Design a protein around this ligand. Structure first.
Ligand code: GTP
Ligand code: MG
Ligand code: MG
Ligand code: MG
Ligand code: MG
Ligand code: MG
Ligand code: MG
Ligand code: MG
Ligand code: MG
Ligand code: MG
Ligand code: MG
Ligand code: MG
Ligand code: MG
Ligand code: MG
Ligand code: MG
Ligand code: MG
Ligand code: MG
Ligand code: MG
Ligand code: MG
Lengths: 115, 68, 435
RNA sequence: GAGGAGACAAGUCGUAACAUGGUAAGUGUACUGGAAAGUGCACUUGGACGAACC
RNA sequence: CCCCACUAUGCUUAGCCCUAAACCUCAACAGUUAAUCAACAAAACUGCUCGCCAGAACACUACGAGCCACAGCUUAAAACUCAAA
RNA sequence: AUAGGUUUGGUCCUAGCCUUUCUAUUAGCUCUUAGUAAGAUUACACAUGCAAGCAUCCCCGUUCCAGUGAGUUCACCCUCUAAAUCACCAGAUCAAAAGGGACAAGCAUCAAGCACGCAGCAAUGCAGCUCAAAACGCUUAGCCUAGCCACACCCCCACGGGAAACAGCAGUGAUUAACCUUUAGCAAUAAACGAAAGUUUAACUAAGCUAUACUAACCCAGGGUUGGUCAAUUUCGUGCCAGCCACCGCGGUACAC
């Protein structure tokens, strides 16, 4: 398909089955379907904890660097994943969501104490 | 039927949905198919009838099952 | 096979019972002002907007009286043909308003309506209409009704007689007051909870909404998602609508509601019962179809045993055809099951078999379709459409295939055309008469 | 409109083929004929000529 | 079928027609007899190349095409039917 | 194929048909539960609802996603080089148009196509080019499936015309043997937009229906067959009739109805 415009993006294509999300990190042309063609698969992400209580994430760091150099964008979930991995700085929204959770927890703690 | 079998096999003439007219065999002991009635027809030739290659399916539309 | 049918719930307890609005069916003789009276009560003028000025459909309307009460008026066809429609209206009615023209007095259809009212065991209110015109003799009307057992109050008869003039809208207020009084005396109530019970008043196929049935609720509330079963058909209620087409959230008892989502078109007058779920509804439908199949199988066994005994007697002792000119094959297409049934009853009244046979190749509800044209071609028949459309493509195909499609919008016009065709097939004018 | 084929199926007229099938059979070709078919000219054995002399 | 008479025809010239059980029913070229070969027939094979065949009948047929052919020849199907041939 | 049945009075060979195996659709009879996958027959016509916004105005998007298979050797490799991303740049990535090569099935009873080539700056000159190694032509078919090509109601196109368009989700009429909800949510991923919190999304997610399939289970089992191929029939009724058979065949007083 002769795609008018568009650009590469490193994003999480969703696979798995119902109630069992699983992600393939794909450097795919942004306009292509989420589960459609992709230039290269750069790793994986299992959101459901395994028996060891781990959320396995595979990152082909060399290829991710290559595609960032070639100009691929980064979807927000992938940016957050890289921030967690430490490959990138913690996302501002990761930090701000942590702060919001702390404030909500403090409010609920105050409510619980006032009982 | 063709020799050596002897019988009076029950058949009907149907205007199949494709526009062709064909003779359909009517299986089972006895039936009630009258003119103007709708039937479903499957393949499978009636061995002892020459030129008849359609069997009226029992229990569908206007052709009820055989009666015990 | 275990009996998995769905059966009308037993009469509700007085604690469950709750006041419900009354259903009044306006019945009478042709052109005696039933629809005009209904128009006056509804505040809307439809009598002018009609094909042939004839009511050919048992129509329901939820009128609201100025006092604030609500009444479900069923305006029924007055022609001789629609006996089944009149009987069904009498069956579903709580009260029967018999409209009799003061000018013309009692008539054959008036007597038929009175008989149906007696059979349904429903109170009768006489509305003597056309009182304005000279020779209007309500006293004569009452005296003649004495013969048919509709005794007025003046003669010590429980039936209330009301002189009205639907044309001038005079005394209709007192007619409505009498209707309200009779409803109060009847003290109509029904359970507004639990599985729904209703009656089909009409059925049809709408090109946008599917198989649509105009029903009247009798017990419990109907809502989107309820699973209904009526006769051999079932639905998951997809859209409930009113006479105006406005979607309505709930259908309380004695409300006329059009229901969509029927997997198959039910017959007019059949009972609608709610069931638990789709699998249960399909089980009920399969059981009912199986029961009908067993009945038909018993009858077919009788016929087949006749044939087989004949053949055995024949044997033990020894030890396509061109259709005649005097055979009119007809396809019948109606806008509603009621119209289809009316035409079929008219046909079944046929008695001129000797001179020319009248074969009914197929009948249905909806626009003349390619399959109808194919049947007509296969049987050199004629398609008769009652208030249905014949698209341009269908017309072209019928012209190519030599079929004759005859659309009509009036029952007696269609019947005149049918008798014309019978006479044409004759070797002269036909001897069968519709009435 | 009519013909052809196949099938079902009995009668009808003959007996053309299968034995040297009672005129050996058949191929091509031509004439002829209720009907298989007959004959003419050439060709094949998918016939025989019994297999010492007699 | 046997007997008699006679014509086309069998012959010559110049053109057509292009069919045969046109069969030795056994393709051309090269090679072998070694370890055999359904039956019959004219023993069994190897290498190589071309031509042809894929159940019976419909069918030396229909349609199309070509042809000095005009009741023709070459090429040549399909539908229906059968479990056989 | 590890094959089997069937030509005959009998044997051998050749051959066709059929049986046994595995899928998918439909139908008949029958059905308890849970998880998951998949789901109009049709490029015929469509009521209704929704499906594209974002945002300090401009811009950007609505060309994407989703859909169908009508059409059909625009899909693959190489050359060249547009558009787009890499905050501007850089060549890098991606990938149009153009050029070269490759690229489905059947019919040759489709064998000729009829200008289908070349040279020259041009003028104009040469008379050539394809084809039995299948040109030209007709019919059929979406393909080579991380997906790709084509279409977007028809007139290939779409200025214009015919006309008023679901082949977007749900749904419907017609049609077919073929027939799922006119559910909820943006909670996740993706896309659009924004500087951003965020907003929209019938994409998608999570649900609804369906024995179409796979997995798992229940202390509530049907369907088919029982002459041979092929596992498995007692007694009756019928008597070449009723009827049965995938093939061979059975039934004229039956392990085949
Ligand atoms: N003289 C007179 N005519 C009236 C009156 N009311 C109505 N009409 C007319 O009587 C005729 C019959 O009225 P309709 O309602 O059409 O008749 P109907 O009795 O319902 O009959 P169907 O057509 O069978 O339904 C019409 O022309 C009316 O306008 C009245 O009070 N007096
Ligand atoms: Mg009226
Ligand atoms: Mg002889
Ligand atoms: Mg002889
Ligand atoms: Mg001879
Ligand atoms: Mg002679
Ligand atoms: Mg020779
Ligand atoms: Mg010849
Ligand atoms: Mg010929
Ligand atoms: Mg010819
Ligand atoms: Mg099934
Ligand atoms: Mg196609
Ligand atoms: Mg041809
Ligand atoms: Mg277009
Ligand atoms: Mg459309
Ligand atoms: Mg849709
Ligand atoms: Mg439908
Ligand atoms: Mg299906
Ligand atoms: Mg017995």
């Amino acid at each position: 398909k002769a795609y008018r415009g568009g650009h590469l993006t490193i994003r999480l294509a969703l696979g798995g089955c119902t109630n069992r999300p699983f992600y393939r990190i794909v450097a795919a042309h942004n306009k292509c379907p989420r589960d459609g063609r992709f230039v290269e698969q750069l790793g994986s992400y299992d959101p459901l904890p395994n028996s060891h209580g781990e959320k396995l994430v595979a990152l082909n760091l060399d290829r991710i660097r290559h595609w960032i150099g070639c100009g691929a964008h980064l979807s927000k979930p992938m940016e957050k994943l890289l921030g967690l991995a430490g490959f990138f700085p913690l996302h501002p929204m990761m930090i701000t969501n942590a702060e919001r959770l702390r404030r909500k927890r403090a409010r609920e703690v105050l409510l619980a104490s006032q009982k | 039927p063709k020799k050596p079998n002897s019988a009076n096999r029950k058949c009907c003439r149907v205007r199949l949905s494709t526009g062709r007219e064909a003779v359909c065999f009517i299986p089972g002991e006895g039936h009630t198919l009258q003119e103007h009635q709708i039937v479903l027809v499957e393949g499978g030739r009636t061995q002892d009838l020459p030129g008849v290659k359609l069997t009226v399916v029992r229990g569908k539309y206007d052709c009820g099952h055989v009666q015990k | 096979r275990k009996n998995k049918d769905a059966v009308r719930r037993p009469q509700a307890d007085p604690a469950l019972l709750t006041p419900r609005s009354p259903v009044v069916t306006i019945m009478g003789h042709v052109d005696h002002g039933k629809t005009t009276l209904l128009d006056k009560f509804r505040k809307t003028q439809v009598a002018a907007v009609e094909t042939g000025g004839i009511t050919q459909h048992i129509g329901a309307f939820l009128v609201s009286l100025p006092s604030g009460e609500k009444i479900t008026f069923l305006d029924t066809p007055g022609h001789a043909a629609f006996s089944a429609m009149r009987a069904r209206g009498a069956q579903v009615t709580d009260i029967v308003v018999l409209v009799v023209a003061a000018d013309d007095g009692v008539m054959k259809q008036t007597v038929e309506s009175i008989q149906h009212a007696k059979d349904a065991q429903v109170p009768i209110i006489l509305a003597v209409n056309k009182c304005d015109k000279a020779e209007a003799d309500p006293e004569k009307v009452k005296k003649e009704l004495l013969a048919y057992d509709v005794v007025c109050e003046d003669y010590g008869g429980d039936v209330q007689a009301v002189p009205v003039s639907a044309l001038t809208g005079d005394n209709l207020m007192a007619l409505a007051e009498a209707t309200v009084a009779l409803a109060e005396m009847l003290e109509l109530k029904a359970d507004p909870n639990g599985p729904v019970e209703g009656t089909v008043i009409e059925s049809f196929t709408d090109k946008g909404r599917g198989l649509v049935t105009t029903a009247i609720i009798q017990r419990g509330t109907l809502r989107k998602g309820s699973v209904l079963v009526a006769g051999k058909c079932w639905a998951k209620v997809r859209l409930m609508f009113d006479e105006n087409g406005k979607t309505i959230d709930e259908a309380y008892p004695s409300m006329p509601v059009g229901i969509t989502g029927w997997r198959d078109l039910p017959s007019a007058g059949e009972e609608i019962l709610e069931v638990e779920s789709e699998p249960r509804a399909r089980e009920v439908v399969d059981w009912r179809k199986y029961e009908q199949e067993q009945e038909k199988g018993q009858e077919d066994l009788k016929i087949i045993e006749e044939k087989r005994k004949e053949h055995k007697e024949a044997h033990q002792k020894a030890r396509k055809r061109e259709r005649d000119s005097n055979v009119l094959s007809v396809i019948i297409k109606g806008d509603v099951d009621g119209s289809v049934e009316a035409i079929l009853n008219i046909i079944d009244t046929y008695d001129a078999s000797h001179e020319c046979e009248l074969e009914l190749v197929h009948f249905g509800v909806g626009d003349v379709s390619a399959n109808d044209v194919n049947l007509a071609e296969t049987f050199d028949g004629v398609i008769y459409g009652f208030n249905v459309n014949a698209g341009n493509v269908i017309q072209q195909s019928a012209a190519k295939k030599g079929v004759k499609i005859k659309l009509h919008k009036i029952i007696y016009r269609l019947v005149e055309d049918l008798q014309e065709e019978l006479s044409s097939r004759l070797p002269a004018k036909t001897s069968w008469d519709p009435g």
